[PDB]
Design a protein around this ligand. Structure first.
Ligand SMILES: [Zn+2]
Ligand SMILES: [Zn+2]
Ligand SMILES: [Zn+2]
Ligand SMILES: [Zn+2]
Ligand SMILES: [Zn+2]
Ligand SMILES: [Zn+2]
Ligand SMILES: [Zn+2]
Lengths: 86, 380, 76, 599
């Protein structure tokens, strides 16, 4: 048949399957990396954690917050890690 | 290789900030008067009324033409009553009620209230009021009467030119004050007026005397707070358990914020010496044969950024002191502490440092600016 | 006003109308051109089925616009 | 004591015009009294004699021989007076007599006539008077606070000359990026050589040169009024870095030197963010097409950009892009190794994938409507589920503007192959059926689901390629603007298109688009509704024609029936089958549920 395909180069873009698209601690969009990681150049090691209250944050920011106190900064409920991004 | 780069100026623009952004138009002393005259002419033509009553309408309604038209269409009778033009709806005396002396009919002037008084008393009252700095506040002598004397009535009662000129100056000042888009410069005899589309509480700078002040209230630029909290905070700074223990705890909490307020105030007030020191530390680097003048230029930008970030911090502490204790206050204070730490880091890297690397310093600048924007974003 | 109406097979029918023409009269133009009855005629423009009571200009049809003619399902 | 010092001046007066006798007297008064008496008498008289003599003499020479010779005379007189001071004055006993006399002499011979020399300074900056400019700079440096007018005049001359040259040469400079960079480099080199020759690279003059060049580069006279300099610089960088013919002949070291010169110029621009945006777009195109001349040069380029002082955001973004390129290079090999066995219609050796971050690269959660072929719709779910294996909590937004590929074209003359984007791919696939047939501009808008503007641009790029003489698609109502396409325009495939080589390869992707308009949802919804109605009508018609037909023949007969309207999709076919079986239009066979019955 006329106009058959020989070679293709697909391109796709990935993003975190989250909501509100904002860490709400540093107010940086989730698809990016946190400021400290971005400055220190340790990229791809900055991930997203979820919670039983259905709130998403950076792993680094949430680690600092739990080092401060154990409660979600958005809803005043005890922080229980539901799942980790990767 | 030549037709390739034709339409690159549009494709690259995949996506285009400044949370405190503002468009102030700069007007001189006469341009403002011209604008006032134009507005008064338009209103007088529209409502088929004289100039003085149109000015009274504009003053009473803050020079908002649309609201004036809407209220005129709704009910014209109450519009003039509220603007103190005509008395509320709900034969010559030949005897002044304030000097008790019989006078001729022609010398017995009166307003729409039909409160008649002799011409000499009118002149005395207008003279004393204009001497007392009273502008649009001239009203009828009769007690409880809210009616005000229009411009075409006051002027013939002013004998000399200096009283007329003072009356004009006070009228202009009151017109600028009552206008919802014009504000006088709070400077020392600065003859300037700032004009803007809509009134808000943002940063304005008079280009003539380089004064920065809040628009809605002619005070220093309080960035995150409002015009009421900062007033009471400045007023205060000048002068289970028992109540006394609560008082001690309140004093401790007040000190916990006042110490940081004073720290940042003094640090900002001592910035000229920092600028001079950085200039000298650049001169010492450039006279010796290493680099040129263009290489050591980012240190001035660093100093400006630190000054801006310190100014932003200084005004967030009264904001956080007058807040309801909940989930929001803790996050705000956490972000505030983060920004404080990063300012300390950058200040150490700029002032008390020997070897300057541009990549690290630029990263610090970006982080500090992002944190300042994050702190200011939530409210504005 | 000279518009264009499309069928399934790809055959094209050309008709001339007026801006004030009611779309029904467009249907009877279709029948004086082709032998398909009005009850089996569904006319669709821009993905929208036209109701019987309407003027052509009310559907924002222009000169060289193309109309789509879809048969009624149970009627055919 | 006064008698001897008085007669010394008479001897000095003779020597000024044209030793031990004075030295012995100096020593006698130095040690007679510890230098206070020498600081009172003797020293003052010597300074007074020098001042009187030179105030009487120097102006006469000035009006005799002019400033050009007067400067040389002043230099010679200063040297002679310094030698006389060192030979006739106490200096070895820690005495400031030499410094005081030098101060008096310079004040009497330079400060007294500085304006007359500074006027000549303003005069002689041009026409290359360096040989006397050096002498003047030597003269004026001794006087405190004397060289600032020289700096001001040099800055003004540099600014004026640069602006005048830019305006005079603005014909071939505004539209060309090579000439702009060449002119900037020539100006910088000329003025740097001038400074080095005239003032032996004094730091103050270097500062003045930098401050003047900063204003020169940032000039609003390019569009006879905006900021276009960063765009031209980025275009030059792209030419140096891309696989253009200009960089084909140059060597790596020469390219690196040219880049270093470009970055040296780049240190003076004011809005570096615009340049970073343009460079990021160019690098995106280069990385996606894989047409880089040298990758290590690009990595050193981003390192140098970080060193120069670019904003910290775009540099980190570029580093992230390079890291993502490496990660995707690994991922593609992993996917190919997985897919090597279960061969599909597309062999695993001719398919590439690139999963990239959505923050560093284009950030847009926009929807693009394209009717993809069957070979591409059977590949998205496979890649999606493969990515959902090792990674959790991650989405995938497929990019259709950046995707590209190679197809082959079969004429009656010969077989070729092309390099096309997804949009041109969808437009070209409309001719798979109805090969030698005309298609209107409106049937295309339905068969490809593309919006009006994108369809117009793609069709214009497909029928009006600049370099080529022969083309693939031709249309009858010829026009010189894509905006004048009418709904009655007819397109057809050029059966006589050729390169007369029977085989060859040409490129149709020139600057793949990185941005499109907001495709309105109303038009796509209307197209979808019309497609649903048409496929329902076709299915019911074929059921009416034959009341008993299996499922396998259904798709073939539907393709044959729907060939002049559009190509039906399997998903929509199944959905419409369900929607019609639910409304009793057709009936499902009881024995084996694959055949349908009409009633
Ligand atoms: Zn975060
Ligand atoms: Zn991180
Ligand atoms: Zn929560
Ligand atoms: Zn009286
Ligand atoms: Zn009254
Ligand atoms: Zn001012
Ligand atoms: Zn205020």
């Amino acid at each position: 048949k006329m106009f058959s395909l020989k070679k293709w180069n697909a391109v796709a873009m990935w993003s975190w399957d989250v909501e509100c698209d904002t860490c709400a601690i540093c107010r940086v969009q989730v698809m990016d990396a946190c400021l400290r990681c971005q400055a220190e150049n340790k990229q791809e090691d900055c991930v997203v954690v979820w919670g039983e209250c259905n709130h998403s944050f950076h792993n680094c920011c949430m680690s600092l917050w739990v080092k401060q106190n154990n409660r979600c900064p958005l809803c005043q409920q005890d922080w229980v890690v539901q799942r980790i991004g990767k | 290789i030549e037709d390739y780069y034709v339409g690159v100026a549009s494709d690259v623009e995949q996506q285009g900030f400044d949370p405190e952004e503002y468009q102030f138009t700069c007007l001189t002393y006469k341009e403002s008067e011209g604008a006032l005259n134009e507005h008064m002419t338009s209103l007088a033509s529209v409502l088929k009324v004289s100039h003085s009553v149109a000015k009274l309408i504009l003053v009473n309604f803050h020079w908002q033409v649309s609201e004036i038209l809407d209220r005129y269409k709704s009910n014209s009778a109450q519009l003039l009553v509220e603007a103190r033009v005509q008395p509320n709806p709900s034969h010559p005396p030949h005897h002044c009620a304030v000097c008790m002396q019989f006078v001729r009919k022609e010398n017995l002037l009166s307003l729409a209230c039909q409160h008649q008084f002799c011409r000499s008393c009118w002149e005395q009252h207008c003279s004393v009021l204009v001497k007392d700095g009273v502008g649009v506040g001239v009203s009828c002598m009769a007690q409880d009467c809210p009616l005000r004397t229009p411009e075409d009535f006051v002027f013939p009662l002013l004998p000399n030119e200096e009283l007329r000129e003072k009356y004009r100056r006070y009228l202009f000042r009151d017109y600028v004050e009552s206008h919802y888009q014009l504000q006088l410069c709070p400077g020392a005899d600065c003859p300037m007026v700032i004009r803007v589309q809509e009134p808000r509480a943002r940063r304005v700078q008079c280009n003539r005397c380089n004064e920065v002040f809040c628009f809605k209230c002619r005070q220093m630029y309080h960035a995150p707070t409002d015009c009421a909290t900062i007033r009471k905070w400045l007023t205060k700074c000048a002068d289970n358990q028992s109540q006394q223990a609560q008082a001690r705890e309140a004093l401790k909490k007040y000190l916990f914020y006042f110490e940081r307020w004073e720290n940042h105030n003094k640090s900002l007030q001592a910035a000229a010496q920092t600028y001079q020191r950085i200039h000298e530390k650049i001169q010492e680097r450039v006279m010796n044969n290493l680099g040129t003048w263009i290489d050591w230029q980012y240190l001035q930008n660093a100093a400006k950024l630190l000054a801006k970030c310190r100014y932003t911090l200084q005004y967030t502490y009264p904001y956080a002191y007058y807040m309801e204790s909940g989930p929001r206050k803790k996050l705000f204070e956490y972000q505030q502490a983060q920004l404080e730490a990063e300012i300390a880091n950058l200040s150490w890297k700029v002032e008390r440092a020997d070897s300057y690397d541009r990549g690290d310093l630029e990263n610090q600048m970006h982080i500090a600016e992002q944190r300042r924007r994050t702190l200011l974003k939530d409210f504005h | 006003m000279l518009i264009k109406v499309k069928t399934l097979t790809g055959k094209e029918i050309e008709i001339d109308i007026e801006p004030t023409d009611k779309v029904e009269r467009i249907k009877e133009r279709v029948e004086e051109k082709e032998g398909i009855p009005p009850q089996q005629q569904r006319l669709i423009y821009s993905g929208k089925q036209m109701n019987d009571e309407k003027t052509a200009a009310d559907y924002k049809i222009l000169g060289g616009s193309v109309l789509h003619l879809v048969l009624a399902l149970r009627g055919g | 004591k006064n008698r001897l010092q008085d007669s010394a001046m008479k001897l000095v007066h003779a020597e000024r015009l044209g030793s031990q006798l004075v030295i012995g007297v100096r020593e006698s008064y130095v040690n007679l009294c510890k230098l206070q008496i020498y600081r009172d008498n003797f020293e003052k008289a010597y300074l007074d004699s020098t001042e009187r003599f030179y105030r009487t003499q120097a102006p006469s020479y000035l009006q005799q021989n002019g400033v050009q010779n007067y400067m040389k005379y002043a230099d010679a007189k200063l040297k002679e007076e310094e030698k006389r001071a060192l030979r006739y004055l106490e200096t070895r006993r820690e005495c400031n007599s030499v410094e005081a006399l030098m101060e008096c002499c310079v004040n009497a011979l330079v400060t007294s006539f500085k304006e007359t020399i500074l006027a000549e300074c303003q005069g002689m900056i041009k026409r290359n008077e360096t040989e006397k400019l050096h002498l003047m700079f030597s003269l004026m440096d001794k006087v405190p606070n004397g060289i600032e007018p020289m700096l001001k005049d040099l800055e003004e001359h540099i600014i004026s000359a640069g602006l005048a040259d830019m305006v005079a040469a603005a014909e071939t400079i505004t539209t060309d990026s090579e000439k702009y960079v060449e002119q900037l480099l020539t100006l910088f080199n000329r003025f740097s050589k001038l400074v080095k020759e005239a003032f032996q690279d004094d730091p103050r003059f270097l500062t003045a040169r930098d401050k003047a060049y900063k204003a020169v580069v940032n000039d609003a006279t390019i569009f006879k009024l905006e900021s276009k300099c960063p765009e031209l610089l980025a275009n030059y960088c792209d030419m140096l870095l891309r696989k253009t013919p200009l960089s084909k002949k140059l060597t790596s070291e020469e390219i690196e030197a040219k880049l270093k010169e470009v970055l040296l110029v780049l240190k003076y621009v004011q809005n570096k963010d615009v340049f970073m945006r343009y460079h990021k777009a160019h690098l995106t195109r280069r990385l996606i097409l894989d047409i880089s001349a040298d990758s290590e040069i690009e990595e050193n380029m981003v390192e140098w950009l970080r060193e120069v002082g670019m904003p910290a955001d775009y540099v980190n973004k570029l580093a992230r892009m390079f890291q993502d390129i490496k990660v995707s290079e690994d991922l593609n090999q992993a996917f190919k190794e997985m897919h090597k066995n279960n061969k599909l219609a597309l062999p695993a050796d001719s398919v590439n994938i690139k999963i990239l971050n959505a923050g560093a690269w284009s950030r847009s959660s926009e929807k693009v409507f394209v009717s993809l072929p069957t070979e591409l719709e059977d590949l998205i779910p496979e890649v999606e589920e493969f990515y959902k294996k090792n990674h959790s909590g991650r989405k995938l937004h497929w990019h259709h503007l950046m995707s590209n590929g190679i197809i082959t074209f079969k004429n009656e003359v010969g077989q070729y192959d092309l390099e096309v984007t997804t949009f041109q791919l969808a437009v070209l696939f409309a001719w798979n059926q109805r090969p030698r047939e005309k298609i209107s501009f409106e049937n295309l808008k339905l068969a490809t689901e593309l919006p009006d503007a994108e369809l117009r641009r793609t069709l214009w790029s497909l029928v009006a390629f600049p370099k080529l003489k022969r083309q693939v698609l031709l249309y009858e109502p010829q026009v010189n603007s894509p905006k004048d396409f009418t709904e009655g325009t007819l397109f057809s495939v050029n059966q006589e298109f050729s390169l007369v080589q029977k085989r060859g390869k040409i490129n149709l992707i020139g600057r793949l688009q990185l941005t499109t308009e907001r495709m309105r949802e109303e038009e796509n919804e209307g197209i979808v509704q019309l497609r649903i109605l048409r496929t329902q009508e076709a299915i019911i018609q074929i059921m009416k024609m034959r009341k008993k037909i299996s499922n396998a023949q259904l798709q073939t007969e539907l393709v044959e029936i729907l060939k002049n309207m559009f190509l039906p999709q399997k998903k929509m076919i199944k959905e419409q089958i369900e929607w019609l079986i639910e409304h009793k239009y057709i009936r499902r066979d009881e024995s084996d549920i694959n055949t349908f019955i009409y009633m």
